[PDB]
Amino acid sequence: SIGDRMKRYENAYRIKLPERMPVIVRIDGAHFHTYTKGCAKPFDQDLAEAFWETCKYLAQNIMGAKLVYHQSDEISILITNYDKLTTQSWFENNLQKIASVSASMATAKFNEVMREKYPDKPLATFDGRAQVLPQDEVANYFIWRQQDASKNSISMVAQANFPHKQLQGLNGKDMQDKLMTEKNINWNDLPVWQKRGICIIKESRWSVDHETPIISKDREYVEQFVYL
Amino acid sequence: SIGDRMKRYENAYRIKLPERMPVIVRIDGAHFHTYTKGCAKPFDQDLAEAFWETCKYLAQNIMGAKLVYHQSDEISILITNYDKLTTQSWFENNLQKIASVSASMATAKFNEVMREKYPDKPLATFDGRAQVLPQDEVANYFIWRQQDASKNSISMVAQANFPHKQLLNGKDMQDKLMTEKNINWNDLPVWQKRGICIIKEFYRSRWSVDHETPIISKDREYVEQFVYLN
Amino acid sequence: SIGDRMKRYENAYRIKLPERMPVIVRIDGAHFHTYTKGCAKPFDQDLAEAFWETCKYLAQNIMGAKLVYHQSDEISILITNYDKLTTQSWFENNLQKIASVSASMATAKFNEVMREKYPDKPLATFDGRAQVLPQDEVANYFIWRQQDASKNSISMVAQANFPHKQLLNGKDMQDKLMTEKNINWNDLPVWQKRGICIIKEFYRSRWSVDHETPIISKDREYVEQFVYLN
Amino acid sequence: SIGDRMKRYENAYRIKLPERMPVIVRIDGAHFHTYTKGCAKPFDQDLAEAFWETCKYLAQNIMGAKLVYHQSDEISILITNYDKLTTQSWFENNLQKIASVSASMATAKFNEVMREKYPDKPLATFDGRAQVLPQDEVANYFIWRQQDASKNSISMVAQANFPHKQLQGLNGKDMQDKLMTEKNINWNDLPVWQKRGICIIKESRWSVDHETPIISKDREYVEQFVYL
Numbered sequence A, D: 001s002i003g004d005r006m007k008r009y010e011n012a013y014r015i016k017l018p019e020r021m022p023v024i025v026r027i028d029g030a031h032f033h034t035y036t037k038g039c040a041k042p043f044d045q046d047l048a049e050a051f052w053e054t055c056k057y058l059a060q061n062i063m064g065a066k067l068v069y070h071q072s073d074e075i076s077i078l079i080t081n082y083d084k085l086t087t088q089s090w091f092e093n094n095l096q097k098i099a100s101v102s103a104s105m106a107t108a109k110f111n112e113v114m115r116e117k118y119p120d121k122p123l124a125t126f127d128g129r130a131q132v133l134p135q136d137e138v139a140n141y142f143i144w145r146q147q148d149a150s151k152n153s154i155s156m157v158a159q160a161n162f163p164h165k166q167l168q169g170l171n172g173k174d175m176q177d178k179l180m181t182e183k184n185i186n187w188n189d190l191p192v193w194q195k196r197g198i199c200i201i202k203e204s205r206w207s208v209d210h211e212t213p214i215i216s217k218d219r220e221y222v223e224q225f226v227y228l
Numbered sequence B, C: 001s002i003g004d005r006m007k008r009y010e011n012a013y014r015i016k017l018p019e020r021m022p023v024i025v026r027i028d029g030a031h032f033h034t035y036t037k038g039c040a041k042p043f044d045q046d047l048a049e050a051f052w053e054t055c056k057y058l059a060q061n062i063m064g065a066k067l068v069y070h071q072s073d074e075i076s077i078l079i080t081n082y083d084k085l086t087t088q089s090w091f092e093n094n095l096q097k098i099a100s101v102s103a104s105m106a107t108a109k110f111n112e113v114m115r116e117k118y119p120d121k122p123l124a125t126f127d128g129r130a131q132v133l134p135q136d137e138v139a140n141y142f143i144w145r146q147q148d149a150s151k152n153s154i155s156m157v158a159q160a161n162f163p164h165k166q167l168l169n170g171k172d173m174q175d176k177l178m179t180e181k182n183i184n185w186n187d188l189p190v191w192q193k194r195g196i197c198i199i200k201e202f203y204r205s206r207w208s209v210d211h212e213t214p215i216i217s218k219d220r221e222y223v224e225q226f227v228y229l230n
């Protein structure tokens, strides 16, 4: 049967993630150097709030979603499927389905919210990737993402205040000190989301936590959704 | 370090399709029974033309895109990456990236166009899946899709005329429409009966809707022209 | 170059299991209905002890091997790679390498031992498959294997006494042996009823056959002792 | 059901190769620097013939097998599954099954044949890996394998005739010329299998082709099994 051959051709890449373990989905903006060209540098409040609305929308429509992290143009989602013995998985842990629909959901909401304040902004697109993590690595994943957040934060602030040559090639600590003595800018005084991104947590409703801690010194902020 | 460790967890599902062979991407609307609940049944011209604009947008932005086929709420895209010896692959044939970005692109264009005439419509979403096919199965793929197009076409038309209980198979609902309701399915336009394709047309070049899209099973070269280069 | 191109085709199926989580490898004899056709039915002591020596050989040569379970012609191996923070993975958790080398090792030892007493026996072959499991499913895996061990055990014994047509389920063939043939299944030794495990025993250390291997469903710590390190 | 969960856990890595395209399996000896320590250097006739018997055994028991190539301690097998419209695949193109059983079959036959001439030789083990290739790349695969064969051949001959220091760091052409003027060894005069390995072809029976050509100048030697 032709339908039977095609079904096998399709099933050859019908990958499913193993169940009963943490699933991480990351959604990233495509060509967001071009897309955010024109936005307020180094940090656009309107753009960030559009991401946060997307994070909420994501957390609301994803089965098993427990925690959403945002920084720059990326969105990380922690998904668990082992709350109960009879807990089901989003799309039955189908890899291509989890990744594509997440990117779809993000795309739909982000473009809607952005074009409310910017009706002539070009279309925004996103990619999506899913994976699994052991329980003792979930907190580490977000710690990894927060460290990348701080590294990019400092660079973005130093880029919007100095020519490229000056920064080359300068450490994070250097650009931080140069921001202080030369521009009266104390990086530490910036709001949390600009320094290390923020998390969206269910409080029920999904809301932004502007007091999102440094996860490396408060791992339970993440692990409370990991070990149940 | 921690980043090295994290990089390996991610790479465990960094799947890549083997290169130099036909790639098929299918995009299907999520819960389009609810989303279309309010559209013109059995066939909505506004909704269909929103997919057609989406189909163009996809073909214009996908490296190696040769043909797009639309039917109902699904979009199949034929991608080839062996035109030359130096032909590169879209996202280097990364599985999760090809599927998601395709769904993202489809989502962006579709929602944009649909807002114009239907700003009250909720957000439309899509899923995406990618795969490879041997050269002598590409035509058979679209033939398989057209056969799924016709079976859905007859059911959609019949379910828009008769009651739920009153309606049997495809050959039954076809003559049930001819006799009982005096409606001829074979008289319907091409895109309603077996869907249509989107092909680059030359004049400069542009992606266009071909309403003279043939039955692939009776014209296999229509697809195979993009499958066999040399 | 050509090698770069070839390297990518191969890497399309260079699959790796995610690290820092339980790995299970199962090895199953190929066509062991024919290979064992000539052995002592229902249970052959020589054949079983050849698997036990194979099970030892596997555990001795597999990085992170914690427990091996034998039953019939299958061999399940529990591998952990998270003992320390610096624990490395066998073949870096390469799927095709873990499965094939396991099957190769099993093939080498088994054929060697079996030749000794049965040099007329044809070559024995095995397949191999690897996977991961969450920590709270490892015990459940072996429990699942022991439940498949008992159902096979009763059938093997019954099929060795009665005619093909004469034999119903497990509870039926169990009392059909007690009444009709006066044979008690529950009186049989452990390895025949529910298989056995191979665990490292301390005295120096060595892998040994534990004939006092309990029913895992009634003693989960027997397995979980290797699953949860801290 | 516990059996249903486990089945899903196992199916998470039940990978199948897409059908109706060339499948390549490569089997490689594990630790064959240690295993062949004691064998005749640079080329052991007995060891090579043991490989050839394995290649035959492989070609006889693998559904769809068309061509087997051997060099050093590796075995490459070309498998096709599109001879007819109703052609089936070995193990239904199950990846882990094709790779493991191939390595199993090789292991069984190789150890049997070797221990006929060397009953006290340690056990030999092998790994196995499978993949797909487009039709216009199959000939190139073996060309790639033959080029690696010649590269290793020259090095092995130069290693068994000179100390390590001398070779460092010398081209293939250099070691070839040094073999000539300094040891009266013309590499080109060596038998085919020592220079670039050989193929096992069905002639029916599977037999060694000691006249196996340089595939880069006779691609039809391979492509005759590719395009049918």
Ligand SMILES: Nc1ncnc2c1ncn2[C@@H]1O[C@H](COP(=O)(O)OP(=O)(O)OP(=O)(O)O)[C@@H](O)[C@H]1O
Pocket (backbone or CB within 6 Å): A028, A029, A030, A031, A032, A033, A034, A036, A039, A040, A041, A042, A043, A044, A045, A047, A048, A071, A072, A073
């Ligand atoms: N709040 C913000 N305001 C202004 N710009 C931002 C903001 N957040 C992120 N950006 C911009 O988004 C970009 C992120 O780039 P990234 O490294 O993700 O690659 P990209 O430009 O998105 O392209 P690709 O994702 O295809 O590699 C940065 O250049 C940064 O300037």
Ligand SMILES: Nc1ncnc2c1ncn2[C@@H]1O[C@H](COP(=O)(O)OP(=O)(O)OP(=O)(O)O)[C@@H](O)[C@H]1O
Pocket (backbone or CB within 6 Å): B028, B029, B030, B031, B032, B033, B034, B036, B039, B040, B041, B042, B043, B044, B045, B047, B048, B071, B072, B073
């Ligand atoms: N031109 C059109 N006009 C109106 N409705 C349409 C049109 N094309 C497709 N539809 C509707 O789209 C639906 C497609 O349903 P499908 O089988 O794809 O499942 P779904 O409802 O999309 O949910 P899911 O995709 O999650 O399975 C049909 O019910 C059909 O009524």
Ligand SMILES: Nc1ncnc2c1ncn2[C@@H]1O[C@H](COP(=O)(O)OP(=O)(O)OP(=O)(O)O)[C@@H](O)[C@H]1O
Pocket (backbone or CB within 6 Å): C028, C029, C030, C031, C032, C033, C034, C036, C039, C040, C041, C042, C043, C044, C045, C047, C048, C071, C072, C073
């Ligand atoms: N101790 C033993 N003595 C005799 N025979 C045994 C023993 N253990 C297992 N067997 C035999 O091994 C066979 C196992 O069959 P299994 O269900 O694994 O399929 P198979 O015959 O191995 O073929 P395949 O593995 O290709 O499916 C049984 O038929 C059983 O008779």
Ligand SMILES: Nc1ncnc2c1ncn2[C@@H]1O[C@H](COP(=O)(O)OP(=O)(O)OP(=O)(O)O)[C@@H](O)[C@H]1O
Pocket (backbone or CB within 6 Å): D028, D029, D030, D031, D032, D033, D034, D036, D039, D040, D041, D042, D043, D044, D045, D047, D048, D071, D072, D073
């Ligand atoms: N005919 C032969 N005679 C003597 N030695 C041989 C012969 N064929 C192959 N060898 C030896 O086999 C070895 C092949 O090594 P290879 O690069 O495959 O790694 P390996 O030693 O097999 O270990 P691993 O496969 O685990 O990396 C060479 O060192 C070579 O000396």
Ligand SMILES: [Mg+2]
Pocket (backbone or CB within 6 Å): A028, A029, A030, A031, A032, A073
């Ligand atoms: Mg980006």
Ligand SMILES: [Mg+2]
Pocket (backbone or CB within 6 Å): A028, A029, A072, A073, A074
């Ligand atoms: Mg980014």
Ligand SMILES: [Mg+2]
Pocket (backbone or CB within 6 Å): B028, B029, B030, B031, B032, B073
């Ligand atoms: Mg749909």
Ligand SMILES: [Mg+2]
Pocket (backbone or CB within 6 Å): B028, B029, B072, B073, B074
């Ligand atoms: Mg659909």
Ligand SMILES: [Mg+2]
Pocket (backbone or CB within 6 Å): C028, C029, C030, C031, C032, C073
């Ligand atoms: Mg078996």
Ligand SMILES: [Mg+2]
Pocket (backbone or CB within 6 Å): C028, C029, C072, C073, C074
């Ligand atoms: Mg079995």
Ligand SMILES: [Mg+2]
Pocket (backbone or CB within 6 Å): D028, D029, D030, D031, D032, D073
């Ligand atoms: Mg080797």
Ligand SMILES: [Mg+2]
Pocket (backbone or CB within 6 Å): D028, D029, D072, D073, D074
């Ligand atoms: Mg080798």
